[PDB]
Amino acid sequence: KIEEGKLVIWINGDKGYNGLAEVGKKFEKDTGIKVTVEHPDKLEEKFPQVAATGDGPDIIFWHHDHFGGYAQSGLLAEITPDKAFQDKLYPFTWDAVRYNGKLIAYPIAVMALSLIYNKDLLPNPPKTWEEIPALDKELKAKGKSALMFNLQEPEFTWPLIAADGGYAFKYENGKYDIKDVGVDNAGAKAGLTFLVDLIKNKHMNADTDYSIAEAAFNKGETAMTINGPWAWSNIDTSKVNYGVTVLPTFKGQPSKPFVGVLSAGINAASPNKELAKEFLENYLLTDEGLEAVNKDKPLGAVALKSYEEELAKDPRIAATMENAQKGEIMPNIPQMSAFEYAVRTAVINAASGRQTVDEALKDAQTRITK
Ligand SMILES: [Cu+2]
């Protein structure tokens, strides 16, 4: 019970649904087809309900992690870019939109955490995790701290923990292995330890949450923090002089951030697959298209090479991409819930004393692979 003759698009209201609308006006002028951009409440939960009955929008915008499940249900259509088109985007973004060996979405935006710092308290940021401890002691002498970041959730703590070799699920030939998890190997143990030790020595507090960390860094009390593109505006208003850069290395290896990709999938029920493909590939994924959305509401870093080289003139953005090329693509499978649940607890119990690192990671590991 879907259109045929137009295009309805569901995008979250905190995104540039206006420039998306603008790009629509050009499509309409060139094709004569009208585009509609809507923002239903809690759309991530409605698409699944409505698409299961052959209804909903022709295109849905969202993080790629939810896309694996959608495909396990045959809700999306297998896109069809050719060799040439595929060479317009970064090789690693296509892996983020794969399933059982096949492509199912178009990478739009690329997100990943970064290290943020107060240029007035820290003229040059640390290239290593190993040196932070000594840096905090040097600042505490003046009534400041070195680092403060959300410690409640895996998104913020996984980068360190996995640098040495840990991981979510083994992957190599286009298929994941839900029985082979790496949160309990040597590397993952090495990283959690380093983190726990930071708290034990009072360089960090275990109850620090997103709000405290942001309030602290924006009042100008802490030299650094870790966060994404979505938090820059608050800082802009606070009157702090900040900078964004590459995350420190661990035991000589890069921090390994989870990589998130805003994607556009075609409803498998949609009678407008061609139009949708023409719109996404030749209107939205162009330097003019991505700019239109980025104006209304900034996107951060993108997957389109040509335009990424232009946005990358803002160090804040160049850093994001570099951190993404070193990170681990977020697995697009429903089992990632088991992972977030288990790891969030492991880190909390390990930071509270309730469990030692070796015990905490043994439980989660077994939990997930269960
Ligand atoms: Cu989600």
UniProtKB/Swiss-Prot annotation:
Record's keyword terms, sorted: Periplasm, Signal, Sugar transport, Transport
Pfam families cross-referenced by the UniProt entry: SBP_bac_1
Subcellular compartments: Periplasm
GO biological process: maltodextrin transmembrane transport; maltose transport
Family: Belongs to the bacterial solute-binding protein 1 family.
Subunit structure: The complex is composed of two ATP-binding proteins (MalK), two transmembrane proteins (MalG and MalF) and a solute-binding protein (MalE).
Name of protein: Maltose/maltodextrin-binding periplasmic protein
Organism of this sequence: Escherichia coli O157:H7
